[PDB]
Design an enzyme around this catalytic site. Structure first.
Site, mmCIF file in Angstrom:
data_model
loop_
_atom_site.group_PDB
_atom_site.id
_atom_site.type_symbol
_atom_site.label_atom_id
_atom_site.label_comp_id
_atom_site.label_asym_id
_atom_site.label_seq_id
_atom_site.Cartn_x
_atom_site.Cartn_y
_atom_site.Cartn_z
ATOM 1 N N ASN A 63 33.188 47.465 38.971
ATOM 2 C CA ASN A 63 32.579 47.089 40.251
ATOM 3 C C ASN A 63 33.552 47.143 41.436
ATOM 4 O OD1 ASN A 63 30.986 44.632 38.228
ATOM 5 N ND2 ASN A 63 30.107 46.607 38.828
ATOM 6 N N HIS A 105 36.384 45.591 41.877
ATOM 7 C CA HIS A 105 37.012 44.306 42.172
ATOM 8 C C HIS A 105 38.330 44.203 41.390
ATOM 9 C CE1 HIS A 105 33.615 41.703 43.871
ATOM 10 N NE2 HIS A 105 33.339 42.980 44.136
ATOM 11 N N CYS A 116 41.222 38.704 45.679
ATOM 12 C CA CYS A 116 42.086 39.658 46.365
ATOM 13 C C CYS A 116 41.335 40.985 46.497
ATOM 14 C CB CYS A 116 43.404 39.831 45.612
ATOM 15 S SG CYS A 116 44.436 41.209 46.196
#
Ligand SMILES: Cc1cccc(NC(=O)[C@@H]2CCCN2)n1
Ligand SMILES: Cc1cccc(NC(=O)[C@@H]2CCCN2)n1
EC number: 3.1.2.14
Lengths: 265, 263
Positions: free
Chosen positions: B185, B187, B222
């Site tokens: 995804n 991330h 982050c």
């Protein structure tokens, strides 16, 4: 994982993991590179190695990758089984060559292939040297005698000369440092990290709309744990070709050079 | 990989790989963390899934708020490790996932882990409590009685972690995630934060000590284009206090503690 009937090649099946895939839910080229590295380690272990020979360990000699060439037709999806067959061959006094064939375990079709050239080096001084006759006889018993090539072709792209990227580069990724996860058991930077670093300068738009088909890498120098790298790219070209260069952030000392080929999804 | 007889937990065996080990030829804590993540994914897939039916409809996802890992023995290169995992409901606070690590040959517990997950709107990133409509669809896959990897009262897994005071004793600055650090995804993988926390630990401590316990509290995610600073201070065996913050504004993304034993 096991050697074939003749004991001249090794096969191993892998089930693709969740953290091993990218945005398309298929294995990244770094997962493929890690799997080729793993099947190569298991081949060396199954035939009694640790892949230094007895004469190499006495003479403080190691095998180092000089070139890596990977061509992918289909990237295995998360949860798929991929079977990899690997074998080694002698290239006279120049060094060794390791080849790989990637297959879908369900369909049996070749979904990728790779070739790599390894040169002999003194572990301490890092001086390359030709393969002596005493070393060649110890690893010839584990190699097929007739030439068995993953890239046979009349003019395959695995033996093509790679030029040096001219400044200024079209794209760049500055300040790349390896972490502890990027180091192997001998505290050296893993060869797969250089592939990831080369691909960092490729724009995200190219990655999102294209699939990586071919990657050729020439290793010139090893990156230290406390070294910082700059990744540089320039488009040379449905298909997209790129010229790559990895150099030390400070003095600009060349560590790698390569080419990539991408096709439209 | 398969669910147990009752279908209330999942087991999977792994053979430790060459690139998965450190200098002592045993799996790194990041390899262990990746394997726990993989067995958790396979448990969710085997029971018809991370998001549920009424969670995709409402744009809701599970996010890790805390991760606690205790290792007694690190599996060596070529060893088989068996991991058993299960989930449990913690009322309206969220979900908990536990793991037990065992040597496949000896059958001995060589490690254990616990994690707390909170509900969050994927788009706005707002937390909010768990409703009863989502609770009932995941309760059929959880044991009803409490089954804890860390049962003991007053244990290291439920301890409050303080914030590291400036100046830090040790630091690693300019940490950027690459494409290999991103999941499907796009991330940043939660295992990358563990590697980043451990980057500020001096190499002498790593060479002479083994990591026994690691507790991490996640405060913020982050981004791919974010730069991180990793900070450490010895609080003591060897104990350390950790802090991950954004290189620019100093926005806190993580805080934790590690415990190390002499080899
Ligand atoms: C072919 C190859 C791959 C990786 C590293 C190296 N060489 C060295 O690291 C040093 C540089 C001076 C000579 N040996 N060569
Ligand atoms: C518990 C946890 C883990 C990871 C990320 C986050 N939250 C966010 O990314 C932001 C911060 C304020 C709004 N939500 N929370």
């Amino acid at each position: 994982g096991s050697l074939t009937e003749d004991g001249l090649s090794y096969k191993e099946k892998f089930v693709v993991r969740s953290y091993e895939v990218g945005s398309n839910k298929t294995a990244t080229v770094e997962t493929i590179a890690n799997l080729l590295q793993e099947v190569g380690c298991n081949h060396a272990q199954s035939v009694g190695f640790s892949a230094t020979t007895t004469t190499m360990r006495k003479l403080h000699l190691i095998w180092v990758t000089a070139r890596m060439h990977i061509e992918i037709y289909k990237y295995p999806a998360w949860g798929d089984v991929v079977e990899i067959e690997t074998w080694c061959q002698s290239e006279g006094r120049i060094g060794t060559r390791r080849d790989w064939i990637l297959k879908d375990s369900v369909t049996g079709e070749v979904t990728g292939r790779a070739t790599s050239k390894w040169v002999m080096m003194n572990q301490d001084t890092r001086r390359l040297q030709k393969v002596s006759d005493d070393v060649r006889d110890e690893y010839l018993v584990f190699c097929p005698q007739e030439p068995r090539l993953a890239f046979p072709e009349e003019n395959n792209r695995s033996l093509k000369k790679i030029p040096k990227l001219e400044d200024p580069a079209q794209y760049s990724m500055i300040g790349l440092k390896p972490r502890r996860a990027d180091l192997d058991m001998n505290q050296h930077v893993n060869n797969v990290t250089y592939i990831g670093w080369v691909l960092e300068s490729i724009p995200q738009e190219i990655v999102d709309t294209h699939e990586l088909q071919v990657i050729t890498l020439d290793y010139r120098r090893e990156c230290q744990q406390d070294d910082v790298v700059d990744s540089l790219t320039t488009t040379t070209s449905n298909d997209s070709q790129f010229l790559h260069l990895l150099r030390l952030s400070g003095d600009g000392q060349e560590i790698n050079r390569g080419t990539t080929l991408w096709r439209k999804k």
